[PDB]
Amino acid sequence: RSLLQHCKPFRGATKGCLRALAMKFKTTHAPPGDTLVHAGDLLTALYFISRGSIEILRGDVVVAILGKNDIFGEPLNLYARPGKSNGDVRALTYCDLHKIHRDDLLEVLDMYPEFSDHFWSSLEITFNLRD
């Protein structure tokens, strides 16, 4: 508890990495009824929700994507290369997702790997796009 509080989690880029993150940070407000992504679109960047909820309508039907805790995207660790979309990403309610390409992600993690340790530790992708 002491180390978790004294450490710098993925609360949203803290003093240090925030400089690089905030730079490559691409905020996106997705209102209730707006489509963030659609089948066929390439996902060369992960999408992290700050607060709210989103629904991805897959060929068959919506899958399951919570709010912020429902982290998802195209992680370099899991996947080596990007890929097309499997379904249609439709926002559920007014939210604010952030898009970040693998390049930017690797950069921030390269300059400040210590953060990733806690970020990937406290944060865990809830949904994996493109398998």
UniProtKB/Swiss-Prot annotation:
Effect of residue 104 to Y: In LQT2; uncertain significance
Subcellular location field: Cell membrane
Role of this protein: Pore-forming (alpha) subunit of voltage-gated inwardly rectifying potassium channel. Channel properties are modulated by cAMP and subunit assembly. Characterized by unusual gating kinetics by producing relatively small outward currents during membrane depolarization and large inward currents during subsequent repolarization which reflect a rapid inactivation during depolarization and quick recovery from inactivation but slow deactivation (closing) during repolarization.
Effect of residue 67 to W: In LQT2; uncertain significance
Inducers of expression: Up-regulated by RNF207 (at protein level).
Subunit structure as annotated in this protein's UniProt entry: The potassium channel is probably composed of a homo- or heterotetrameric complex of pore-forming alpha subunits that can associate with modulating beta subunits. Interacts with DNAJB12 and DNAJB14; chaperones DNAJB12 and DNAJB14 promote tetramerization. Heteromultimer with KCNH6/ERG2 and KCNH7/ERG3. Interacts with ALG10B. Forms a stable complex with KCNE1 or KCNE2, and that this heteromultimerization regulates inward rectifier potassium channel activity. Interacts with CANX. The core-glycosylated, but not the fully glycosylated form interacts with RNF207.
Region span, cNMP-binding domain: 9-109
Domain notes: The S4-S5 linker acts as a signal integrator where it both couples voltage-sensor domain (VSD) movement to pore opening and closure, as well as providing a binding site for other domains that regulate activation and/or deactivation of the channel.
Consequence when changing residue 73 to E: In LQT2; uncertain significance
Effect after changing residue 51 to W: Predisposes to LQT2 and torsades de pointes while taking the drug amiodarone; in vitro studies confirmed a significant reduction in potassium currents; the ECG abnormalities reversed on drug withdrawal
Family in the record: Belongs to the potassium channel family. H (Eag) (TC 1.A.1.20) subfamily. Kv11.1/KCNH2 sub-subfamily.
Effect of residue 90 to W: In LQT2; uncertain significance
Protein name (record): Voltage-gated inwardly rectifying potassium channel KCNH2
Consequence of changing residue 128 to H: In LQT2; uncertain significance
Processing after translation: Phosphorylated on serine and threonine residues. Phosphorylation by PKA inhibits ion conduction.
Tissue expression as described in the entry: Highly expressed in heart and brain. Isoforms USO are frequently overexpressed in cancer cells.
Outcome after substituting residue 34 to Y: In LQT2; uncertain significance
Top-level division of the source organism's lineage: Eukaryota
Clinical disorder: Long QT syndrome 2: A heart disorder characterized by a prolonged QT interval on the ECG and polymorphic ventricular arrhythmias. They cause syncope and sudden death in response to exercise or emotional stress, and can present with a sentinel event of sudden cardiac death in infancy. Deafness is often associated with long QT syndrome type 2. Short QT syndrome 1: A form of short QT syndrome, a heart disorder characterized by idiopathic persistently and uniformly short QT interval on ECG in the absence of structural heart disease in affected individuals. It can cause syncope and sudden death.
Full-protein interval shown: 734 to 864 of 1159
